């Protein structure tokens, strides 16, 4: 199907404890492949997937140089944002940045993005035309003015439409065994009484890739959205994912309830039944 490359950057001020924390991670789809950690000893961009280890020394030296430039900008940004919002040195604050590109099943460019957040909420984001900005408040408007005058969007568009997709395709080919695979979920339902008149029905999906999946309960064909407990899709640790959805039902009504599983690795959506 479609594919994505995304870089995630987390920057955290640490009042009275010196330099801020800086963590960068890169993903292709749901597979991480690089990291940089300001608190680690190496001070290098490091591999986190087997298929990126084959990149040569120029790759690792260059990515280390560039991630440190990201770190330096974010270090300055924390001070700038203190000024924009008239905030004291006493509090810790969080900057997050995410950018990347998506391609379709034909591997052609679908969309690019670059999003920036301060203390957990939208700050500024590149719009989908890759030519203009959405500024979430008045402080972000200041950034917007500065980024328009410095033609930041034009350089970002060139990266997102060119470099980003070219290297995403390279990674997809070099790691095709890992990245171009689909593991269909292994599904079942469990049944456990919570009393003499009610039972928990839990619909399970295991060992699937990629992480995108939909689990739904129906009662006589009607969606049970408000009565379903749906846990966050979670990593198994081996490159696959797990998820479950549960309802609590009156004992004896089990046959009314069906679980429905959607995943791109299934030939067709699955319906699991108690009869």
């Amino acid at each position: 199907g479609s594919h994505s490359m995304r870089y995630f950057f987390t920057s955290v001020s640490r009042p009275g404890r010196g330099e801020p924390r800086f963590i960068a991670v890169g993903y292709v789809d749901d597979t991480q492949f690089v990291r940089f950690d300001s608190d680690a000893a190496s001070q290098r961009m490091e591999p986190r997937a087997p298929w990126i280890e084959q990149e040569g020394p120029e790759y690792w030296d260059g990515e280390t140089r560039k991630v440190k430039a990201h770190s330096q900008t974010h270090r300055v940004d924390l001070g700038t944002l203190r000024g924009y919002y008239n905030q004291s040195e006493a509090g810790s604050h969080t900057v997050q940045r995410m950018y990347g590109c998506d391609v379709g099943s034909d591997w052609r460019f679908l969309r690019g993005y670059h999003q920036y957040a301060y203390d957990g909420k939208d700050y500024i984001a590149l719009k989908e035309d890759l030519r203009s900005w959405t500024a979430a408040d008045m402080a972000a408007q200041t950034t917007k003015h500065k980024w328009e005058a410095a033609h930041v969007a034009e350089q970002l568009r060139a990266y997102l439409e060119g470099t980003c997709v070219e290297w995403l395709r390279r990674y997809l080919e070099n790691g095709k065994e890992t990245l171009q695979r689909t593991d269909a979920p292994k599904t079942h339902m469990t049944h456990h009484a919570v009393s003499d008149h009610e039972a928990t029905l839990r619909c399970w999906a295991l060992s699937f890739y990629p992480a995108e999946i939909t689990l739904t309960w129906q009662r006589d064909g009607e969606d049970q959205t408000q009565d379903t407990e749906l846990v966050e899709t979670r990593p198994a640790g081996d490159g696959t994912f797990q998820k479950w959805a549960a309802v609590v039902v009156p004992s004896g009504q089990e046959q009314r309830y069906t679980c429905h599983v959607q995943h791109e690795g299934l030939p067709k959506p699955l319906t699991l039944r108690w009869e």
């Binding site: 890169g26 260059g62 990515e63 990201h70 940004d77 350089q155 990266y159």
Partner: peptide, 9 residues
């Protein structure tokens, strides 16, 4: 790979 230009906010 990363983008090479990272302009300050």
């Amino acid at each position: 790979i990363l983008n090479a230009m990272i302009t300050k906010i």
